[PDB]
Design a protein around this nucleic acid. Structure first.
Ligand SMILES: CCN1C[C@H](C)n2c(c(O)c3c(=O)n(Cc4ccc(F)c(Cl)c4)nc(C(=O)NC)c32)C1=O
Ligand SMILES: CCN1C[C@H](C)n2c(c(O)c3c(=O)n(Cc4ccc(F)c(Cl)c4)nc(C(=O)NC)c32)C1=O
Ligand SMILES: [Mg+2]
Ligand SMILES: [Mg+2]
Ligand SMILES: [Mg+2]
Ligand SMILES: [Mg+2]
Ligand SMILES: [Mg+2]
Ligand SMILES: [Mg+2]
Ligand SMILES: [N+]
Ligand SMILES: [N+]
Ligand SMILES: [Zn+2]
Ligand SMILES: [Zn+2]
Lengths: 368, 180, 368, 180
DNA sequence: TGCGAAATTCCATGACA
DNA sequence: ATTGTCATGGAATTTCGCA
DNA sequence: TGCGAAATTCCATGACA
DNA sequence: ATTGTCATGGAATTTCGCA
């Protein structure tokens, strides 16, 4: 404060204030003659308030805030005081965008067997067709084999009815889905437990986590579209055709159709593959077990040059899921409890609840 | 002669009338010849229409080269013939009035009868478990269940409790009270 | 047809059919013994129909279509016949996604003077405030200096009222905007012509073209948000504050505030820059002319590895602007009349109208 | 003494009452001292409220260091004083009852009177062009228009037709019919 | 043991609300 | 207390037919 | 004529419906 | 018959204070 600035005026040396400059009093204020011109050196006790005034004009970041201040003032290490303030501006922290990308995606192992894991989701609402509005899409993780069910609503009960029809064929170990109301209801949990099925949920608002089914939605809509060109959008009668069509389509990277991966032999559909005509079923199932283990598996891509990865104890902010107009896009800062993997974390949200959350719905809080 | 395969031949047949359940009365039974895998469909009648509606669901998962049946009206109609022709399915009929499939069909009737006692009306809901039981049932002839033969893997519902399949003295007298 | 296949059976050589393979008759069909097994060689006259059957199962692209066919058939140059068919499938062409990126963006020269070009746009609807729902945002191209006007609707008449207030200060040579109803109405054109103002329109649905104003919208909403944190969204009284705040904020790359670029001297606002205190106004305006010409100008970035650039006479498809559910995302193919620049073209749309269109709303039609 | 600059001093004053136009009666006149640039604002009254409402618009574009006015009630009120203090503007008053600005103010009154004849009621709409005329009018003393001095560039509306500014014999007699 | 062209593989692009 | 995916069609690379 | 640290510049990231 | 932009805050690079 006034003490430090006194020593300064009478020629003494203070750490941070370069001795090679001429410091003086004028208009009752300590000034200095810097290459860019004469600036006021406010007392340390004044500085916080100045930075705040500068920042608050437009809630500007580091440089734009500094440039305002530098117009009138100089003191040692200005930006440190700027950054200190930015880190304490709740409005800036919850409103600004991130400028760091997530670390590279994980490519989890393909489930080992058919029926190990189902990925499920709803598409819709679609145009009304026979009074139906939605599609339940069920994708077997290992095979890509897909089941389609039309529904009137994306509800637990319609999910339960459909899954009862499906699970007539086989029961899966795990069913994985997003946190839609249909899948998180206790009624659905009882239905799962009753049958030995473990429910696994994606982190909230991160449909990539169950990307298999999401990607199949795309193909389903794409084929429905092509088939409905120039007709009214009567899709109900097309569901079965699309199911069969997609289950018997080749993935060019795999060289197999989901049907082939499920059964190891084409059924009586057009252009059925005849290669195993002379094998016994047992020989065929043996070649199948082999084909299933040797399928192409993609690898984790290179990180972008400015990615960030979560560290226990770090301050991070969850993305607001459905931000209202003129409201912040980010929640208040929270703390990383556990790093489950480099792309998923548990945070404590200031309330404080535990939330398991995708890195893609997080930014690291700026300025520590 | 090339070896027998799944989807080579589906054997279909109707069971019923049964006591009403959710307004349904019959069961369409489909058994794959080679694997012995069974699919069941509740119908309101043993008609060509009900058969087509049912097999349309099945044939959106797998299409048989051949369907085999007895000369039931539902199967010998020209509508059913047209339906099959559209899908490139050859129809096959056993001569009027006269292995693996025959046994499976017996198991189904017997398994059904054992469960429609004390609840002759709740069978609609039981169909899924009936099928799972049937398809995860060990075959004496081959070393494998139908599940194993269709999918080339073990099932997550092995039915290790090979159940009586016979009527207990409680059910024998409770079945003769049902007819009365 | 049957002619070609006759020569083939009796050991003769035909171009395309490798002589080193054994060709034979069986079940009344010409077969061949290929390393992958025995395939039928259909007659040339049968082939188109086969490809079509294969493709139509799921409207699959090149490889997935080929893999179906190869199950039963072989003939020379199968994929050429596949590609021929894909190029003729209207449903595939109007529904599939592009897999080619646009060429790199242009960075047009900054307008040379204040008032040479205005970029204008509406933000909204916002939450009701004093009965207002929208903001007219006017951005001077050279300075970034911005004017904000609250409106009840994004209409010509509200635009006209606002621009009359603004043009009291100065008249611009050009006003550039998107094709919103407010700006394309004949009433607005008469208003422009009356005052010597040329109206310039961005290509449809390409807000990057007038990116200056779009980017300013972001800052406007961002600052409004910060200011409204924890209060009800009463933004009307904040417009003037935001205007002033933004016009006096530094662009860190520029080292100037839009106000400085407009006037060459700060007004009586907090942290006013004092550097030209000793210059005359004339000296100040001289330094200003100099600052205006030496502003950082960004350069066109490197092209992505799989970009495409338009060529006169090429078949291309305009993106459907507001595709209904289950309807194609692309219009029918059209023809490039003129290449205005590597990022903008005139097309003839089959109707056939002339349309000037952004490359970003185009894909090149596949398989020629 | 540092040289005179834009925003150093705004000279404000009211003109009116005028004949009603869109319910407005007065004009708040703001002239920048250094550039001679003029901003005009239609008001319903020469009150502190109307002044604040008007200057709030102007001060969202540019804030003067000093406002100068006569001792009009609207300007000497403590509300106006508070308003100015909030914005860090020093208020300045000419003594009661007694260059570049004075001339500009004369031009405004004269230009206004020349246009409120034959249409004494359409002036609200004319304000924009009045201002553009005023600000693209050549200054005899300096070589430059107010536009040029404020922005450091030529204008896209140069008023090369330096108009009479005087009343023609048609308007002189048409103005003495207006008062009657 | 090397050529031209066909086949196959590679892989950026974009879309799943 | 969890996790992207994969059809697509030009381009790049490999293999084929032949010598 | 070179060190450590501060200042400045660089620039990927994301959002404008 | 037209065209992306630019605040942001860590990182990279340059300049400063001193010797
Ligand atoms: C209510 C529970 N809930 C949460 C959110 C609404 N959600 C749900 C979905 O099924 C989806 C969905 O399919 N896509 C499409 C999409 C977008 C980008 C991608 F990378 C991928 Cl793989 C998929 N987006 C979202 C979403 O989060 N939008 C912001 C979404 C859902 O059911
Ligand atoms: C009706 C006339 N019309 C056409 C479309 C509706 N449009 C209009 C707008 O003002 C915007 C707009 O601000 N953004 C936001 C945006 C998105 C990405 C970017 F790169 C940038 Cl620079 C801006 N998007 C669209 C749009 O085209 N959405 C699909 C948009 C407009 O007025
Ligand atoms: Mg969902
Ligand atoms: Mg989804
Ligand atoms: Mg029978
Ligand atoms: Mg717009
Ligand atoms: Mg816009
Ligand atoms: Mg007066
Ligand atoms: N994993
Ligand atoms: N340009
Ligand atoms: Zn802030
Ligand atoms: Zn197609």
């Amino acid at each position: 404060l006034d003490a430090e600035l006194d020593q300064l005026l009478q020629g003494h040396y203070i750490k941070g204030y370069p001795k090679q400059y001429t410091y003086f009093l004028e208009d009752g204020k300590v000034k200095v003659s810097r290459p860019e011109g004469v600036k006021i050196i406010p007392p340390q006790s004044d500085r916080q308030k100045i930075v705040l005034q500068a920042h608050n004009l437009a809630h500007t970041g580091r440089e734009a805030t500094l440039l305002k201040i530098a117009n009138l003032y100089w003191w040692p290490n200005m930006r440190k005081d700027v950054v200190k303030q930015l880190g304490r501006c709740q409005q800036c922290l919850i409103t600004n965008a991130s400028n760091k990308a997530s670390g590279p995606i994980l490519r989890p192992d393909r489930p080992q067997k058919p029926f190990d894991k189902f990925f499920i989701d709803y598409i819709g609402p679609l145009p009304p067709s026979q009074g139906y509005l939605y599609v339940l899409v069920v994708v077997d993780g290992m095979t890509g084999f897909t089941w389609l069910y039309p529904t009137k609503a994306p509800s637990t009960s319609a999910t339960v009815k459909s899954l009862n029809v499906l699970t007539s064929i086989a029961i899966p170990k795990v069913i994985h889905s997003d946190q839609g109301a249909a899948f998180t209801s206790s009624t659905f949990a009882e239905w799962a437990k009753e049958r030995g099925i473990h429910l696994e949920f994606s982190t909230p608002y991160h449909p990539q986590s169950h990307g298999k089914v999401e990607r199949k939605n795309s193909d389903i809509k794409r084929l429905l579209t092509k088939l409905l060109v120039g007709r009214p959008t009567k899709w109900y009668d097309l569901l079965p055709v699309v199911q069969l069509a997609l289950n018997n389509t080749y993935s060019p990277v795999l060289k197999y159709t989901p049907h082939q991966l499920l059964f190891g032999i084409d059924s009586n559909t057009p252009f059925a593959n005849q290669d195993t005509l002379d094998l016994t079923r047992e020989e065929e199932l043996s070649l199948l077990q082999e084909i299933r283990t040797s399928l192409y598996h993609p690898s984790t891509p290179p990180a972008s040059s400015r990615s960030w990865s979560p560290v226990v104890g770090q301050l991070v902010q969850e993305r607001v899921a459905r931000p209202a107009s003129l409201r912040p896009r980010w929640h208040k800062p929270s703390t990383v409890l556990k790093v489950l993997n480099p792309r998923t974390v548990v945070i404590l949200d200031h309330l404080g609840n535990n939330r398991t959350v995708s890195i893609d719905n997080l930014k690291p809080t700026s300025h520590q | 002669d090339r070896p027998q395969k799944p989807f080579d031949k589906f054997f279909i047949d109707y069971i019923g009338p049964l006591p009403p359940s959710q307004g349904y009365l019959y069961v369409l039974v489909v058994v794959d010849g080679m694997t012995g895998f069974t699919w069941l469909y509740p119908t309101k009648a043993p008609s060509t229409s009900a058969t087509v509606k049912s097999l349309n669901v099945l044939t959106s998962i797998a299409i048989p080269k051949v369907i085999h049946s007895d000369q039931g009206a539902a199967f010998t109609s020209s509508t059913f013939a047209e339906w099959a022709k559209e899908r490139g399915i050859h129809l096959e009929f056993s001569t009027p009035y006269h292995g693996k499939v025959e046994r499976k069909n017996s198991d189904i009737k017997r398994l059904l009868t054992k469960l429609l006692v004390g609840r002759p009306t709740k069978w609609y809901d039981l169909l899924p478990v009936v099928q799972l039981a049937l398809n995860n049932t060990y075959s004496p002839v081959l070393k494998y269940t139908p599940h194993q033969l269709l999918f080339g893997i073990d099932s997550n519902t092995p039915f290790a409790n090979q159940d009586t399949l016979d009527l207990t003295r409680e059910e024998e007298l409770s079945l003769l009270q049902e007819i009365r």
